[PDB]
Design a protein around this ligand. Structure first.
Ligand SMILES: CCC[C@@H](C)[C@H]1CC[C@H]2[C@@H]3[C@H](O)C[C@@H]4C[C@H](O)CC[C@]4(C)[C@H]3C[C@H](O)[C@]12C
Ligand SMILES: [Mg+2]
Lengths: 1316, 603
DNA sequence: CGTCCTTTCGGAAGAGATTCAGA
DNA sequence: TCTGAATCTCTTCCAGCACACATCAGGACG
RNA sequence: GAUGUGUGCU
């Protein structure tokens, strides 16, 4: 069964395999993150609760005073979204936090409080997120882009290659906290382990080990395993473990019990090791001179005199052994320092270490961190305590601790947010293990190492920054306590929190202006994962490895949707099914696979939980129970695609669309396009502008109905019902009683957003797609937004294309467009631009908006009214006056040069203390009328229902129905009836009627007072007048047109209708494209789209033929069923026998323009099915017809490819790019022409063009470029006079920018001058 | 500068100067008050830091910030860097009498013509229009003429058409990599807002028509106009300055037209007919009595200048096609007929233009290039040489080759499980057998494409070079290669990981019949490697060419002969195999240093 | 209003600055 | 135990062009 | 007017 906006035009689906999981809510990261930040969360896991519980309760310097947090709440916004956009104010909600202030008595750390007080204190007005994941900051719609940064934790890298210039790889352990200082550890070409805090400068790691309260013997115990020599009767034999001899050369005769085992010089083989273990002899004779290469572990002091014979960590020799023997040290402990496995790195580090004890190490750390100050014990101790060991300045977050414990093979993922001695020592141990040869480094770009930090987490950090500033101010204030009078508001300042939140939401690197020129642009801007921003990398200093697409991007990040140029691979787009884990890592769905059955249960596997398993490919033919057809199937185990047996797999991809984003999944026949062309197609699809009339794609993907609904442009029904009234600007739904609330049933009203301005100066405009008296259900579209067709995304128009060269008018990539395309106005767009006029109170009195403009004619003031503003609807042109403002002594707002349009809406704002202008209130008196028109309709419906209830009570107990309507409707309650509880209900209903009148009056007055608010403006201004010009841009030679397969082009000629090629039926071709654009840039998707559009339009032409001459519904039903049943084995399977013989006529009437066809991304139609569908029409199976030349009437001597391609009008218009300048205004400091098109500016003859003029030898052209039509002011007017004098000759001088350079160098202590 | 309002916009130098004067005045007041030595010492240190921040801010440890926590611009920060006085306002600068717009084709133009919008030439040439509205007596002052061109009367459009007559304009494209990126064209006024740009100069500009824009500059003075006409005219630049190669080369539609016209199919509407000249060939083709690919015998007269610059004619009866005889009507007098008596690819007509230049000079070549362009466009439009999905012909043997390669990799896996081969040997053998399979598929596809067309020769049956559309536009050199036609009809082949290691299982499909969800993800590694490469490569090549210009910027050939007996010994470069570059290319067009001795030694 | 005031995904030359290890 | 060679901090630059927004001393005592 | 941010096109 199909939805109500589905048995109206049902798109044929050529997809072949069933979707076990439907596409989720597209803008889910934004809404979920902000809901997490803004919610009332117990236990304070995340949100405002976490910040408050992490900053409060705050206390003074043990001054028996504490400000503690009780709760918080969000007040209702003073406006709604639409009024916030209209006025120019943030859609924010006040933050009312209930704090408590407790002060203790003298000598009472735990005693009774002197005074306990609590109140609700306002601090900051945090912007709210709209229902579409956007923010309204200053009347404009912004999007906070999610960020992809390195997760907190420990990362072991190598930095192989370019160190030491010897081909020796190093290794570095970097500990990145979520907030705090870094703790890099690194090696040396001499293999010495150095620590580096905050990237400052190297110093030995044993310095920080000693700073962590460790002595030399303890460090050697930690990092090395002891080998013990025993003083005995003779030769000082050593206890030996046969395992430690793995891979060494026998320094002497390895023998035990008098039996020789290994000869001198021979390699200690594994056979020797196993036979020695079988013998199980640990005490081995060792020559005395062999120990010369060993390093003592523990310090040995004398027994009698107590003097140190040998300190810890020093070499040994015969003299040292003799000095130890005369003292009688029966135990010698040395370090097992294997040259291959267990290298002596800590020993050499201790050799380089200059510090000796803890105090020396702390002083050295203080000197490194803060150079130029005399260190002290307390200062160094406090600095090292607050470096990585205080919750106030260091924080491994939950993710930091989780990754830290996972990387060290720990078990618990929870723990302390601050570092510990054990954590640092384990990091060092893991680094040493990696250096030895065991273990492996981890790649940084792996998606198990990079988090996603969305709006709900970014906004919390800035709020926390504001909170720590506030608590610092309070701690400053709480020591100066004048108690018994201080409420918890005179110490709180709401300026830091508001400043931080406003700075984050308004002016940040990720709080971007929303891309709003079709639903796809905003729906893909909200699902944008940027690697840049605060705490991330930069375009200039990003290598190629961050650019590339990792094998873990499968299902989590799109590989073919990223902008070209400076940041490619830094601004990745989220995949369709991609989700964010509880920690922030990207996880994607996978169907669980049992022993042989692909189950329907789905698990969301992240990047690290994916290499463990072997995951079946998205298209593997299961047979009705989930058994793969072959015994082998292509899979990917650990970032490696290869074949596997059927029984080995344990997961399968949910859909074939999950590898691509939501923009790349709107390309039909994506799998036939080269990935470069696919990337360009996705981007240019984002840049398409909405046309005058939306037109559905004949060759779609089935993701159009999700994008056009989840983006929020469409007016979608909230509760199902029956349409009661459809206007061009409002829809009224009478909700079914099955879905109405018991109290205050009523209706639903949808006020459509009529012609208004988007961020890109385009027109977003909703028009109804329903008709009067028509049932709708929940969640189905009622009005189509900008560039949607019946709740289905429609970015361009389907036009009849021919792939042929046509006299060189489509030479490189150009497009030859028929004149019928511009006659039909199907690419005509509407562009709305606002112009502002502000009245400020300057000196000599303020400036007013009167129409009394001096030194202008009556034709100048003809367009303005008597109030001084232009009439709504006046077709203005370049130079006309829109607003009249006078300078006391004329700064009237006038139309800029070259911009036409029609004034569609004039908008006036006034601050308090400015009385009004008649225009200013006669505007928004319409808003009052519109509010009354809704409230009165609701009142009428509710009153009619109440009076019907009254009459229905009256039909019982002596019904008097003939006399009810004769008397007016006021007195219908006290007629002849009983005095039972029904009469009590009648009196209660009369009381409710009075209550309804009073509440309608009070709510209408509330609406009027809220609309008539002061809407306080910027300081120094009086009133703002905004005038909205709307222009129609027709297609013309010069502006870009594209397809969905990366085939862009610039229109070179608008050919007449009779000059375009035509087929044997005389039908001309709309667009002529170059065939040579296909083989080179291998985008075969456009050709197959052309063929499938030809088949679809053939089906539509058959239906239109059967509908034009009237035929019975049986024939139409049979043909439409024959069209929908066509395919190999499709999943759609529509049945027209369940249609009501009237909604099949509406279906056929919607299919007469061409039957829409869905071609899912990697599960699309095939050439056999396209040819079969062409045969279902009357079209050639080859897709090529014989076209005739339009201007000579003879054949092109080849069948040419003619079809229907979906063309998009990209937002690069030619009238927005054409610019010219002879003379205009010049800059101030350097007298050069200004820049850009707004300022009447000139093109920049750059540094590289000067070289091109020098190469030619054009010395005079270059001189006139850099002197006369530039800086040189004296020789610039003489040239103008010469040119309008009949002469062409210049008197060049010196460019005024060189004199600026001379004066700026002379403003240093440098005398630069010109000689003679 | 006054910002919008009563406020005044910040200036960093004013802030630094106020900061210096504050400390200077405080120091003077302290020294007048005989303040203690430590306080005035700190004041002097603060004055020193203020002056250091004024002169060169940031050369100290921490640059001071005026507002927004960003360091403010000092005196030394507006002389250096890309935003300094040198590289922003002195080496290059914004220029009056200039504009920019999108470029379209306009294939009707000649080599020396561009098409300027009628609304852009009225703004560039505005003082020139004033100087004729004030000279024809159509205006009396500057205000009258200014308003006349403001309201755009019907009399300023013929004044403009007279100003624009022989006044060249420079057309520059933004990455001016070499000097051919600025060329001067004579303007033609057009209706529209796009600058129509001749197709033959696009190769020099490196400009397609997918949305790039050009800048028009107007030479004002007479010396500037004569430099634009005698040095920068697109007529004068038909040879590259980097090497002796032509730069006016037909490309991708002119060459497809000339390839389709000059080809032979062994059958025709008229194949036995013997024509009496090129004009009869055109008369027969246009009437539909003969095919453009016939095999006729035309009686043609060709001229040769083997005399002392004098052209002698010779008439012969040559076996050619109708198309090759139609094309002979544009080839100028002096070129041999065996320059169009073949199947003209891109190289064939590039060599035809090159030999026309060296035999007949410059003016016949400039006339010839436009004729080639027009007659290529016309006969490419007439062909209707489209592209469909049936043109990419999959070999019937592709499935068998792929199955054989699957069997061989299964055999190699069986050998590896038994332990006969190591991991690296297994990987190398699999890569080699898959490369061999890819080569076999490519060869089968190319054979089945090139010799596909079998046509009855008016007798039994015969093969010929195919008229496959995609094969024609790959063979002609118009638009295509072997690798791309292989990726369309053969198999895509072995794809590499981002690090560089080849994946041991190639893409076994191609763009005609789909790609897997995984085969398409594998392709994106090398697809985005080659896009990030070109994104990061422009910023690295620009720096190199800037340093090269600034090193060598000032050599200029100043003397005429220095009289030296030194030089270099130019010898052909030999790396061990084929000669990388012969002696003729390395020694051409250079003055010898000593007399070379013939192997008639001592002569 | 007037007016005074205070961090951290870089790679080469090259210029201090130290060390070393050698006589 | 003074000296040339090997490591150690700090400087500079990293292609060109349009176009949107934001911020420009403002906090505070008198 | 200067700077920054971001997008886009080459
Ligand atoms: C199993 C439940 C998981 C939940 C308890 C843990 C796991 C990851 C934690 C978040 C991350 O660390 C990132 C942020 C760190 C900052 O401090 C601000 C909070 C922040 C959102 C954390 C809140 C919470 O603590 C999270 C969700
Ligand atoms: Mg281009």
């Amino acid at each position: 069964v199909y939805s109500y906006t589905e048995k109206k035009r049902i798109r044929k689906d050529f997809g072949k395999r069933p979707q076990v999981l439907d596409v989720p809510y597209l803008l889910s990261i934004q809404l979920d993150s902000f809901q997490k930040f803004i919610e009332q969360d117990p236990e304070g896991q995340y949100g405002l609760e976490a910040a408050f519980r992490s900053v409060f309760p705050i206390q003074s310097y043990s001054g028996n005073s504490e400000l503690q947090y009780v709760s918080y709440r969000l007040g209702e916004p003073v406006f709604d979204v639409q009024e916030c956009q209209i006025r120019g104010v943030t859609y924010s909600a006040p933050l009312r936090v209930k704090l408590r202030l407790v002060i203790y008595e003298r000598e009472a750390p735990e005693g009774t409080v002197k005074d306990i007080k609590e109140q609700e204190v306002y601090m900051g007005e945090i912007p709210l997120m709209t229902d579409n994941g956007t923010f309204v900051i200053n009347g404009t719609e912004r999007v906070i882009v999610s960020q992809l940064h390195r997760s907190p934790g420990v990362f072991f890298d190598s930095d192989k290659g370019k160190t030491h210039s010897s081909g020796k790889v190093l290794y570095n352990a970097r500990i990145i906290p979520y907030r705090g200082s870094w703790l890099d550890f690194e090696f040396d070409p001499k293999d010495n382990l150095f620590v580096r805090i905050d990237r400052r400068r190297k110093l030995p790691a044993t310095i920080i080990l000693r700073a962590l309260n460790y002595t030399t013997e303890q460090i050697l115990d930690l990092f090395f395993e002891k080998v013990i020599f025993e003083i005995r009767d003779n030769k000082l034999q050593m206890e030996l473990v046969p395992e430690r001899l793995r891979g060494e050369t026998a320094s002497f005769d390895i023998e035990a019990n008098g039996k020789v085992y290994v000869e001198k010089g021979r390699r200690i083989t594994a056979r020797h090791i196993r036979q020695l273990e079988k013998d199980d002899v640990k005490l081995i004779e060792v020559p005395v001179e062999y120990i010369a290469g060993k390093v003592v572990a523990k310090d040995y002091i004398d027994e009698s005199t107590g003097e140190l014979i040998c300190a810890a960590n020093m070499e040994l020799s015969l003299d040292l052994l003799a000095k130890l023997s005369q003292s009688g040290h029966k135990r010698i402990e040395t370090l097992f320092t294997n040259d291959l496995d267990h290298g002596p790195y800590i020993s050499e580090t201790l050799r380089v270490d200059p510090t000796n004890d803890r105090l020396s190490a702390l002083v050295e750390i203080y000197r490194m961190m803060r150079p130029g100050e005399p260190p002290t014990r307390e200062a160094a101790e406090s600095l090292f305590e607050n470096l990585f060991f205080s919750e106030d300045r260091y924080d491994l977050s939950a993710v930091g601790r989780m990754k830290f414990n996972r990387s060290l093979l720990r078990e618990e993922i929870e723990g302390s947010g601050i570092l510990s001695k054990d954590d640092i020592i384990d990091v060092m141990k893991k680094l040493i293990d990696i250096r030895n040869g065991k273990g492996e480094v981890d790649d940084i770009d792996h998606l198990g190492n990079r988090r996603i930090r969305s709006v709900g987490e970014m906004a919390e950090n800035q709020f926390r920054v504001g909170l720590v500033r506030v608590e610092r101010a309070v701690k400053e204030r709480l020591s100066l306590g004048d108690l018994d009078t201080l409420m918890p508001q005179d110490m709180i300042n709401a300026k830091p929190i508001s400043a931080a939140v406003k700075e984050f939401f308004g002016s940040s690197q990720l709080s971007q202006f929303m891309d709003q020129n079709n639903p796809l642009s905003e729906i893909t801007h909200k699902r944008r994962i940027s690697a840049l921003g605060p705490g991330g990398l930069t375009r200039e200093r990003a290598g190629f490895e961050v650019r590339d697409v990792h094998p873990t991007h499968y299902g989590r990040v799109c590989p073919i949707e990223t902008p070209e140029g400076p940041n490619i691979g830094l601004i990745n787009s989220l995949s369709v099914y991609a989700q964010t884990n509880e920690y922030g890592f990207l996880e994607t769905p996978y169907r669980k696979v049992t022993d042989g059955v692909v189950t329907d249960e789905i698990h969301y596997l992240s990047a690290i939980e994916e290499g463990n398993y072997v995951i079946a490919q998205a298209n593997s033919n299961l047979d009705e129970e989930g058994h793969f057809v072959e015994d082998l199937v292509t899979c990917r185990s650990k970032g490696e695609s290869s074949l596997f047996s059927r029984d080995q797999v344990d997961y399968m991809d949910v859909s074939t669309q999950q590898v691509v984003s939501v923009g790349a999944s709107l390309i039909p026949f994506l799998e036939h396009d080269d990935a470069n062309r696919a990337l360009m197609g996705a981007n240019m699809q984002r840049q398409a502008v909405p046309t005058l009339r939306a037109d559905k794609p004949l060759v779609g993907t089935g993701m159009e109905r999700a994008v056009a609904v989840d983006s929020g442009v469409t007016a979608v029904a909230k509760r199902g019902g029956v349409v009661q009234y459809v206007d061009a600007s409002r829809i009224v739904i009478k909700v079914n009683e099955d879905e109405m609330y018991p109290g205050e049933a009523g209706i639903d009203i949808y006020n459509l957003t009529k012609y208004t301005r988007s961020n890109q100066n385009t027109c977003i405009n909703q028009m109804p797609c329903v008709s009067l008296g028509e049932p709708v259900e929940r969640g189905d579209v009622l009005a189509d937004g900008p560039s949607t067709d019946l709740g289905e995304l429609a970015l361009g128009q389907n036009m009849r294309v021919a792939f042929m060269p046509w006299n060189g008018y489509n030479f490189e990539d150009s497009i030859l467009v028929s004149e019928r395309v511009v006659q039909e106005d199907r690419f005509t767009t509407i562009h709305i631009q606002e112009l502002a006029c502000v009245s400020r109170d300057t000196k000599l009195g303020p400036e007013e908006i009167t129409a009394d403009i001096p030194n202008v004619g009556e034709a100048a003031l003809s367009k303005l009214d008597e109030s001084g503003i232009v009439y709504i609807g006046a077709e203005v042109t370049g130079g006309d006056i829109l607003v009249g403002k006078v300078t006391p002594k004329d700064s009237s707002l006038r139309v800029p040069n070259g911009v036409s349009g029609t004034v569609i809406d004039v908008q006036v704002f006034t601050r308090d203390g400015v009385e009004k202008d008649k225009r200013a209130l006669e505007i928004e008196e319409m808003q009052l009328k519109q509010a009354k028109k809704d409230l009165s309709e609701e009142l009428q419906i509710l009153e009619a229902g109440l009076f019907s209830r009254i009459r229905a009570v009256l039909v019982a107990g002596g019904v008097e129905a003939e006399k009810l309507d004769k008397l007016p409707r006021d007195r219908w309650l006290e007629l002849g009836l009983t005095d039972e509880e029904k009469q009590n209900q009648l009196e209660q209903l009369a009381e409710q009627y009075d209550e309804l009148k009073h509440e309608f009056e009070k709510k209408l007055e509330a609406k009027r007072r809220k609309i008539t608010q002061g809407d306080d403006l910027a300081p120094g201004v009086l009133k703002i007048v905004k005038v909205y010009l709307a222009v129609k841009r027709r297609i013309q030679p010069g502006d870009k047109m594209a397809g969905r397969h990366g085939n862009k082009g610039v229109i070179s000629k608008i050919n007449p209708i009779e000059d375009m090629p035509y087929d044997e039926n005389g039908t001309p071709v709309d667009i002529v494209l170059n065939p040579l654009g296909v083989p080179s840039r291998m985008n075969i998707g456009q050709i197959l789209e052309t063929h499938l559009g030809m088949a679809a339009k053939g089906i539509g032409d058959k239906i239109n033929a059967m509908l034009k001459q009237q035929q019975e519904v049986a024939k139409l039903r049979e043909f439409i069923q024959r069209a929908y049943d066509l395919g190999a084995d499709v999943r759609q399977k529509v049945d027209l026998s369940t249609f009501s013989d009237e909604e099949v006529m509406r279906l056929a009437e919607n299919l007469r323009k061409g039957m829409p066809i869905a071609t899912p991304v990697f599960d699309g139609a095939k050439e056999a099915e396209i040819k079969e569908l062409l045969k279902l029409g009357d079209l050639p199976t080859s897709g090529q017809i014989r076209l005739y030349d339009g201007r000579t009437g003879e054949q092109f001597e080849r069948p040419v490819t003619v079809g229907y391609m979906y063309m998009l009008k990209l937002n690069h218009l030619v009238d927005d790019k054409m610019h010219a300048r002879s003379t205009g205004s010049y800059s101030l400091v350097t007298q050069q022409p200004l820049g850009g098109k707004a300022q009447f500016g000139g093109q920049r003859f750059g540094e590289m063009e000067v070289w091109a003029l020098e190469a030619y030898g054009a010395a005079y052209t270059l001189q006139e470029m850099l002197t006369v039509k530039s800086d040189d002011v004296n020789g610039r007017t003489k040239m103008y006079k010469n040119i309008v004098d009949g002469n062409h000759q210049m008197e060049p001088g010196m460019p005024e920018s060189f004199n600026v350079l001379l004066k700026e160098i002379r403003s240093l202590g440098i005398n630069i001058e010109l000689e003679d | 500068v006054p910002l919008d309002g009563g406020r005044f916009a910040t200036s960093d130098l004013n802030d630094l100067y106020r900061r210096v004067i504050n400390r200077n005045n405080r120091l003077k007041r302290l020294l007048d008050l005989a303040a203690p030595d430590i306080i005035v010492r700190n004041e002097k240190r603060m004055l020193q830091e203020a002056v250091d921040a004024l002169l060169d801010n940031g050369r100290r440890g921490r640059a001071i910030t005026g507002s927004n926590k960003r360091p403010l611009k000092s005196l030394a920060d507006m002389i250096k860097g890309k935003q300094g006085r040198f590289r922003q306002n002195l080496l290059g600068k914004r220029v009056d009498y200039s504009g920019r717009s999108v470029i379209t084709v306009g294939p009707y133009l000649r080599l020396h013509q561009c098409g300027l919008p009628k609304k852009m030439a009225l703004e560039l040439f505005k003082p020139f229009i004033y100087g004729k509205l004030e000279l024809r007596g159509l205006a009396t002052t500057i205000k009258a003429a200014k308003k006349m061109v403001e309201r755009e009367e019907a009399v300023v459009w013929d004044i403009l058409d007279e100003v624009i007559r022989e006044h060249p304009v420079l057309l520059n494209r933004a990455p001016t990599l070499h000097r051919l990126g600025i060329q001067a064209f004579e303007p033609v006024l057009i209706e529209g807002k796009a600058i129509q740009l001749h197709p033959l100069v696009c190769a020099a500009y490196n400009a397609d028509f997918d949305g790039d824009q050009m800048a028009v500059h107007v030479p004002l003075t007479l010396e500037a106009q004569l430099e634009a006409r005698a040095l920068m005219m697109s007529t004068n630049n038909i040879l590259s300055p980097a090497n002796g190669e032509p730069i006016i080369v037909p490309s991708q539609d002119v060459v497809l037209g000339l390839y389709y016209m000059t080809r032979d199919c062994v059958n025709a509407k008229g194949e036995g007919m013997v024509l009496t000249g090129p004009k009869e060939a055109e008369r027969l083709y246009r009437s539909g009595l003969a095919s453009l690919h016939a095999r006729v015998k035309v009686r043609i007269t060709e001229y040769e200048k083997d005399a002392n610059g004098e052209l002698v004619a010779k008439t012969s009866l040559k076996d050619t096609t109708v198309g090759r005889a139609i094309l002979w009507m544009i080839v100028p007098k002096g070129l041999p007929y065996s320059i169009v008596n073949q199947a003209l690819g891109k190289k064939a007509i590039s060599k035809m233009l090159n030999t026309c230049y060296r035999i007949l000079g410059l003016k016949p070549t400039v006339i010839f290039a436009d004729q080639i362009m027009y007659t290529g466009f016309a006969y490419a439009a007439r062909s209707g040489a489209s592209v469909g999905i049936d043109d990419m012909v999959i070999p019937e043997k592709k499935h068998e080759i792929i199955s054989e390669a699957e069997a061989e990799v299964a055999e190699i896996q069986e050998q590896f499980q038994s332990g006969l081969v190591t991991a690296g040997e297994r990987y190398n053998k699999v890569i080699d057998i898959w490369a061999a399979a890819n080569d076999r598929v490519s060869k089968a596809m190319m054979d089945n494409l090139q010799t596909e067309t079998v046509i009855n020769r008016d007798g039994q049956e015969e093969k010929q070079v195919s008229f496959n559309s995609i094969y024609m536009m790959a063979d002609s050199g118009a638009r295509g290669s072997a690798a791309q036609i292989r990726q369309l009809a053969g198999m895509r082949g072995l794809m590499a990981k981002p690090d560089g290691s080849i994946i041991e299982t190639p893409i076994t499909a191609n763009f005609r019949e789909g790609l897997n969800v995984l085969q398409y993800f594998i392709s994106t590694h090398g697809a985005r490697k080659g896009l990030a490469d070109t994104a990061l490569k422009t910023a690295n090549s620009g720096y190199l060419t800037r340093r090269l210009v600034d090193v060598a910027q000032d050599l200029v050939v100043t003397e005429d002969d220095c009289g030296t007996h030194e030089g270099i010994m130019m010898t052909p470069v030999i790396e061990g195999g084929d000669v990388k570059e012969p002696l003729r290319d390395r020694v051409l067009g250079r003055v010898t240093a000593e007399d070379v001795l013939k192997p008639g030694t001592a002569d």
